[PDB]
Design a protein around this ligand. Structure first.
Ligand SMILES: O=C(O)c1ccccc1O
Ligand SMILES: O=C(O)c1ccccc1O
Ligand code: NA
Ligand code: NA
Ligand code: NA
Ligand code: NA
Ligand code: NA
Ligand code: NA
Lengths: 147, 138
């Protein structure tokens, strides 16, 4: 019934992220959206003009994988993909008017997911966990840079 | 700001990249290392019990296990009381790389917590466990 105190950090993070992928599917699956697509959408939303290959590098996924996810968003009309004028083989990405309209819907699902996850967490604990997460995300980025 | 999930994805992503660098030469992935370690902790564990443990689909666990047995790290035997069931065991070869795998996991955590004190480190870990148990309920 209870969880092993054995599981390494990565395992627990995987469990948490696991439920988020499931939550996204159930809450936005009918809009033909997946966690990966949502990930790309938000990332592009926060940085219009970002290149497909840069998105590939950020998520550390291969070309085909990123292309397939980006292809579904474009098909849904949420993003537009254009050839980079300075390099015809690169693709500049942008969230469309339509895509910007669902961003809010996505943020609400994230908010609800977070409230559900921090059910047993006090206000102080939650803000502290978040603060710790940021510090660690910052460390992970340093690590990618170290190697 | 960035959703919580974004921060956790970023963190978990460095672990995925780290395993590739440290164990890629063994064609091992995050999923494979995880299964391999769990089987090592629970010899004779059932394939379906492993899938229920990770909260992953039967098809996914199966593809991950095929990778491990193809590399010779694990062996599968039909469950003696249900031939449509498989029981898992780490092989001699698999047991040879476990220590290396454990050192790698340990080193990823130490790298991530380099600017964390022992206590913050313990707390963060405790909270993740709490959030994880909740995730299971949800
Ligand atoms: O899921 C992510 O990786 C992500 C990254 C940046 C911003 C929002 C996100 O959901
Ligand atoms: O994503 C995981 O964490 C995972 C773990 C064990 C087996 C298959 C998997 O995809
Ligand atoms: Na954009
Ligand atoms: Na997708
Ligand atoms: Na590109
Ligand atoms: Na538009
Ligand atoms: Na979130
Ligand atoms: Na794999």
């Amino acid at each position: 019934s209870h969880m092993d105190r054995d599981i390494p950090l990565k395992g627990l993070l995987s469990i948490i992220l696991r439920s988020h992928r499931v939550f996204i599917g159930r809450e936005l699956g009918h809009l033909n959206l997946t966690d990966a697509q949502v990930a790309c959408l938000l990332r592009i939303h926060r940085e219009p003009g970002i290149k497909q290959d840069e998105l590939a590098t950020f998520f550390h996924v291969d070309k085909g994988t990123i292309a397939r996810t980006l292809r579904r968003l474009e098909e849904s009309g949420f993003i537009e993909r254009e050839q980079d004028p300075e390099n015809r083989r690169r693709y500049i990405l942008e969230v469309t008017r339509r895509g910007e309209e669902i961003i809010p819907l996505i943020l609400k699902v994230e908010e609800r997911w977070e409230d559900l996850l921090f059910r047993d967490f006090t206000e102080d604990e939650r803000k502290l966990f978040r603060k710790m997460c940021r510090r660690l995300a910052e460390e992970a980025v340093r690590m990618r840079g170290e190697w």
